[PDB]
Every structure is written in C-alpha cells, then in structure tokens.
C-alpha cells in the first residue's frame with residue numbers, strides 16, 4: 001500500500017492547498033516574524049496550517065471562509081465552546097471593576113474554594129499561568145518536602161512545554177533527575193520504585209495519557225504507583241490538567257485513588273490562561289508566606305479575568321453534572337466509532353475515556369505509546385484532510401474532544417465522516433485479523 | 434533606636450489592622466483554601482495583605498473603601514492603569530470574534546511584527562504565557578543551540594518563579610547547571626566566563642535588576658558580558674521583561690548592546706497573561722516545525738485576547754514615544770527624591786532608571802544586592818504603612834512604578850509623602866554620616 005498512500009496524500013495536499021489560498025498567504029507572511037509562522041508546535045501541520053478567523057459555539061471559520069464543526073476545542077481547554085455568553089459576561093464584569101489590581105482580590109478565593117470542594121484531594125492550592133507552571137511547582141514542592149531528588153515519570157508522558165518524555169526526556173525537558181518508566185507496566189514500576197526508593201521524591205503521572213494518544217492508565221498500574229510511592233515515602237502527583245474533566249470530580253476520584261498533589265489547567269480557567277497545583281495542606285504549607293521556606297512568584301496568577309471566567313464556567317456551564325453528561329455522550333460516540341471500525345474490518349480504533357478519544361491505525365489493546373510507535377502517520381494525515389473536506393475541524397494527531405455546544409447532529413456528522421473515510425480509503429487501510 | 438523601631442512598627446500594625454477589618458475578614462476566609470490566602474508570594478505582607486476591590490486609571494480601592502494613588506502598577510505589568518478603554522475594547526472585540534480558536538489566528542502575527550519592529554534585536558519570536566516561561570524557553574534554546582550545559586547568571590538575578598538567585602539558586606529554582614557570579618563585577622565576569630568557556634551555553638542577565646532593587650547594570654560590566662560571551666561561544670540573553678519599558682526601544686538598545694536572545698513580558702500583553710522570547714533567526718529556527726528539532730508547546734500562548742490587548746496597548750497607549758516620555762517623568766521624580774533625602778541627611782535613596790525606582794535605607798553606591806545585605810527591613814515596612822496613611826499604594830519592598838494615568842499632582846503627593854515620612858520618623862532613620 002506504500003506507493004498508493006503516498007499518492008493519496010499528495011492529492012490531499014493539493015486539494016487542501018487549492019481550497020485554502022488565504023490561509024496559505026497568511027502563513028507565508030507570518031513566517032517572517034515567528035519560526036514557521038508558529039507559536040505553539042501542535043498547531044503546525046504540513047503543507048501549512050489553516051488560519052482560524054472566527055468561532056461561535058462549536059463552530060470555527062478559517063481565513064478562506066470555511067465553517068467547521070469543532071472536534072478539537074483547544075486541546076480540551078475549550079469545553080465551553082468559542083463564544084459562551086456566561087464566560088464573556090463574567091470577563092466584561094471583571095474588567096469593569098478594574099484589572100491588574102496588584103494585590104489579593106475579591107475573585108481568587110471564590111475560585112480556589114470551588115476547586116478545593118469539587119476536587120477534595122486538593123485541600124489547598126495555588127494558581128499558576130499554565131499547566132506547565134503547575135507541574136513545575138508541584139515537582140518543586142515534592143523535592144523540598146521529601147528532601148530527595150529523583151522524579152519518576154512515564155514514557156509518553158506529557159506535562160507541559162519543558163516536561164515531555166519518550167524513552168528519555170525530550171530535548172526541551174528541564175534537567176531534573178528523571179527516572180523514565182514504561183506506562184501501564186506495574187511490575188517494572190514496583191521494581192524500579194523499590195530499587196531507587198530512598199532517592200525518589202515523587203511519582204508524576206497522568207491517569208490517562210493525553211498527548212500520547214488517550215491511553216487509559218490501568219487500575220492495577222495506577223494503584224501500584226500509589227502503593228509503591230507510599231511504601232518508599234515518595235509523593236504521588238496526578239497530572240489532571242486534562243483528566244479532571246472526565247468525571248464530575250475528575251478521573252482520580254472516579255477511580256478512588258488519592259494523590260498527594262494534583263495539577264489542573266486548561267478548561268478550569270474558563271477559557272482563559274490558567275493552571276493550578278494543590279493537594280495536602282502540609283505540603284502546600286511550604287508556600288505559606290508566613291511560615292514556609294518556598295516562594296511562589298508570578299505576575300498573572302490571580303488575575304481577575306481568569307478568576308471570573310473560571311468561576312463562571314465551573315458554576316454555570318461545566319458543572320459536575322455537565323461533566324458526567326458530556327462523559328456519557330463521549331462514551332456513546334467512542335462505542336459507535338469502534339463498532340463501525342470493527343464492522344468494516346479495518347485496523348482502526350478510538351481509545352480514551354468519556355469526552356476524550358483518539359483515532360489510531362492499529363489493532364489490539366493500546367496500553368502505552370510503544371504500541372503506537374509504528375502507526376503510519378500518513379494515514380493520520382489522510383484522516384485529518386478527509387475530515388476538513390467533510391466540514392469537521394479535528395487535530396492532526398487524531399485527538400477528538402467534545403465541548404458543551406456540540407450537538408447530537410454534529411456528533412452524527414463525525415461518525416458519518418469516519419464511515420465515508422473507511423468507504424473511500426478501504427484499499428489503503430490496514431486490515432483487521 | 435532598635436526598641437523604638439519595634440514600637441513604631443507594632444503601632445503601625447495595630448492602626449493598619451483596625452482600619453482594615455474587611456481585608457482582615459477576607460484574608461482569614463481565603464487562608465482556608467490557599468496557603469496564607471496567597472497565590473503570588475510578593476503580594477503577601479504582615480500582618481495581612483489588603484484585598485483590592487476596584488481599580489480605575491491609576492487609582493485603587495481596598496475592601497474597606499480606602500482610595501489610593503497606585504505607585505506599583507502590577508509590578509510594571511500595569512503601565513496602562515486599571516481601566517484603559519483601549520484595552521477593554523480590544524479584549525471585548527476579540528471575545529466577540531470567538532476565543533479558544535485552536536489554530537494560527539489573525540492577531541498573533543500583527544503583535545509579533547509590532548514587537549520585532551520595536552525591538553529589532555528580535556528577528557523572530559514565539560509567545561509564552563509568562564516571563565518565567567519565556568526565560569525557560571530562551572535557556573532551553575541556548576543549551577540546544579550550543580550543545581553546552583552551563584548557564585551564567587548573577588547574584589540577585591530574578592528571571593521568574595523557578596529562576597531566582599541570591600548568592601546561590603533559590604530553593605524553587607530549576608536544577609540547571611547555574612554558575613552564579615556577582616552583579617556589576619566586570620573583572621570576575623571576564624575571568625570566570627573565560628575560565629569555564631567551553632562549558633558555557635549562555636549568559637543570562639537583566640540590564641537593570643528589578644526584584645533585587647532597581648540596580649542598573651553598569652556599561653563596563655554589561656559590555657564585558659557581551660565580549661566574554663562572544664569570545665567563548667556562548668549566547669548572551671538579556672532578560673528585558675522589565676527593562677523593555679525603560680526607553681522607546683528598551684534598555685539594551687539605549688545602551689547599544691546586542692544580545693543573541695531577548696525575553697519580554699509584563700506590559701507587552703496589554704495587561705493580559707503574556708511572555709515572549711526571540712532574537713537571532715538562526716537560533717529561533719530550532720523551533721520552526723518544518724525543519725527544527727525542538728517543540729515549543731503551550732495552550733494559551735497565542736490566545737486572541739492577549740494578542741488583541743497587547744497590540745492595542747502598544748499602538749494606542751504605550752508607544753515608543755510614550756515610553757520615552759514616562760521615563761523622563763521618572764528621572765525627574767527620582768532626582769527630586771534623592772535631593773530630598775540628601776538634604777535631610779538620612780541614609781535613604783532611590784535607585785533605578787526612568788519610570789522604575791526603589792527606596793533603599795542605605796548610604797552610598799548601590800551596585801549589587803550585596804550592598805543591601807545589612808538594611809533594616811522594618812524601615813521598609815514603616816515606609817509602606819506610612820504611604821498607605823498618605824493615600825498611596827506601594828510595594829512592601831519599596832519598588833515604585835509609574836503608569837500612564839498618574840498625574841503630575843499624584844507624583845507631587847508621593848514626594849510630599851516621603852517628606853512627611855522623613856519628618857515624622859527622623860529619630861528612627863539611619864544617618865548618611
């Protein structure tokens with residue numbers, strides 16, 4: 001199928017290029033001032049990325065005027081859609097009270113309380129400006145609290161712009177003392193955490209890996225991390241920047257597993273810049289300016305616009321009930337997609353939990369990024385371009401994200417588009433056994 | 434004297450407490466959910482910080498209704514004041530077009546171009562969500578570009594929440610291989626950079642240290658850094674997160690010293706969450722997704738609200754011309770204050786450049802944080818509380834920051850308040866000689 005796939009992809013590039021001349025012009029101009037016209041690597045794809053001009057609800061428009069149903073929703077940050085009035089009105093009201101207030105304010109405590117109550121494993125928290133900052137601070141807290149240096153993470157793990165892992169840390173990863181272990185391998189985790197126990201400050205893990213392909217952590221593996229971390233005296237940190245959305249009180253609570261710290265981000269700030277870290281009060285005490293040894297400084301951490309937007313979103317829109325309902329809608333979609341793939345006999349599946357899923361061109365159980373390392377990326381590209389042709393805006397990597405305004409008809413369009421993808425590319429796709 | 438200062442401080446605490454019961458109530462309530470009720474360490478001060486309820490122009494109101502002239506302006510981020518309609522209208526218009534757009538957009542390129550034009554040592558840039566992230570990325574870029582690991586920084590250096598230095602890296606500082614050298618010591622800088630030449634990836638420095646107390650970098654020292662970095666093959670990185678506002682095209686341009694990379698933050702995002710790193714196109718090429726080996730990820734980096742607010746602020750309000758004019762007003766103020774202190778014979782002075790200055794209770798030249806090691810912190814507190822009594826909201830650390838809405842009358846009131854401070858605390862303040 002090698003040559004045929006190359007040809008199909010060349011055809012797709014041509015069709016995309018011809019359909020999007022304003023986006024191509026914009027790309028060429030913008031490449032003068034930013035490398036590859038780009039400020040967030042995931043937003044770039046070949047031959048050039050679409051410029052997005054406008055959004056409303058779960059609709060996006062590109063520079064050439066195409067309207068799409070949005071199935072990516074700012075990589076899970078955009079759970080409210082692009083134009084929620086509750087969010088916009090909260091931000092406008094905050095701005096009318098004054099911004100850059102340079103002190104403790106009347107909004108930060110409301111959002112802090114809400115988060116501690118909704119995610120009770122967070123006894124106290126502090127706000128950051130990103131998920132990346134939240135994870136850096138959580139790691140810093142654990143190193144100091146334990147007096148140890150080694151940090152256990154998992155291959156495929158993504159914790160932010162300077163905290164990413166393959167078998168080894170990514171080229172942009174901060175040089176902490178990382179021990180990188182295989183995801184969903186409880187035996188190796190127990191053995192290695194025991195071997196290095198007295199040196200391990202922290203075990204940092206996503207309860208479902210996001211960036212690596214929506215790969216659920218198996219309960220026996222996640223429990224092994226909790227058991228081993230407690231055994232050796234390390235802190236367990238759950239990175240729930242993505243997974244906090246997956247159940248009314250997040251995925252760790254759904255699983256009944258308690259981490260010492262938890263990090264949050266993306267949608268929790270109402271669509272605005274946001275992160276948070278929190279957990280045990282005795283660990284968070286390190287940052288109490290009255291008595292603790294650690295400073296945690298930043299400029300925009302408690303900004304009134306983020307505080308207002310986050311509080312409005314979590315109280316009026318993405319409530320605990322709404323999180324559960326969106327999860328149910330996502331489970332139904334993933335089941336339909338997997339049934340379709342199986343019925344058609346193709347080696348294609350969708351992995352994930354609830355409102356988050358990812359297309360993969362492999363058969364069998366997907367338990368780690370290793371199971372996906374051989375996937376033909378040209379097929380992911382063909383899928384992406386096919387979806388654009390079917391008026392659906394997805395991610396190049398095949399990550400599908402539900403948001404609140406997405407209609408049942410929109411979801412039907414996605415399933416139909418996968419059907420037409422399989423129907424039209426049947427000669428190119430790997431066959432199931 | 435020592436006993437009398439303790440007494441005066443106890444009195445100030447009591448008066449502050451009695452006058453601010455709503456702020457005290459708010460602090461106690463919020464301390465349940467955030468350590469010390471706090472999310473940004475600099476905002477905490479004893480006995481408890483004021484809650485800020487409202488801002489308009491260069492005025493702030495606390496929870497108990499006290500109105501202050503604002504002389505801190507979000508630690509330089511708030512150069513536009515608290516309610517600039519140009520900023521608010523830009524943000525509103527951006528929100529109306531849709532947020533969380535999940536792609537390259539129509540606003541990021543405009544702001545990138547504007548910044549590159551304003552600071553021509555920046556050939557290309559990428560946006561981040563904070564100054565801390567910008568510095569992390571600049572360092573990461575330099576390590577990869579050079580294939581070296583050692584990073585030269587300076588005592589008292591502040592580069593963000595996980596990049597702070599006293600004589601040694603602060604407890605929260607990421608464990609890069611830092612070599613910490615004395616600020617404003619040209620001879621030591623040349624010797625140590627040359628001695629460790631082959632190991633040094635980067636020399637990272639503020640052209641005027643901000644957090645350590647508005648300490649100008651001397652021409653001989655900064656030139657020694659440029660020369661030494663070039664000699665050994667290291668990159669020079671200027672952290673202009675604060676200093677970019679100090680002249681029409683930033684401090685480094687005024688001094689005529691070209692760094693290989695420059696980091697920016699605070700006011701450049703129009704008061705919204707923001708940072709940027711940029712410089713030589715060949716270094717920034719590491720991040721071009723078409724060809725470069727480095728990813729730079731981050732959810733909110735190119736968000737339309739920041740892109741809109743930044744562009745509106747820089748084009749309509751804080752233009753290069755406005756930066757020059759505000760710097761002139763600041764120079765005039767600093768000279769007035771220094772003349773007053775000298776005339777009164779007190780060991781008190783204000784250090785800095787242009788629109789940024791800092792009170793210090795020390796006599797003689799301030800060249801590094803080491804010169805401030807024996808200062809009595811209780812005197813800074815007495816000043817802070819005195820200024821509150823005189824309807825002036827300042828920083829506990831004595832950092833004074835001009836913003837655009839401040840009137841000449843507001844500035845006169847600051848000078849008068851320092852006059853009344855010296856007049857009323859004569860017996861308590863150290864003498865010049």
Ligand SMILES: *Cc1c(COP(=O)(O)O)cnc(C)c1O
Pocket residue numbers: 129130131132133135158159160161206210211239240241242243265266274275730731732733
């Ligand atoms: C997006 C994400 C992060 C990083 O958050 P940013 O705000 O983009 O820095 C960290 N962890 C996970 C699991 C994420 O999905």
Ligand SMILES: *Cc1c(COP(=O)(O)O)cnc(C)c1O
Pocket residue numbers: 297298299300562563564565566568591592593594639643644672673674675676698699707708
């Ligand atoms: C404020 C500041 C930073 C950090 O920026 P944040 O947005 O608070 O992370 C870095 N460098 C200097 C010189 C600063 O003043």
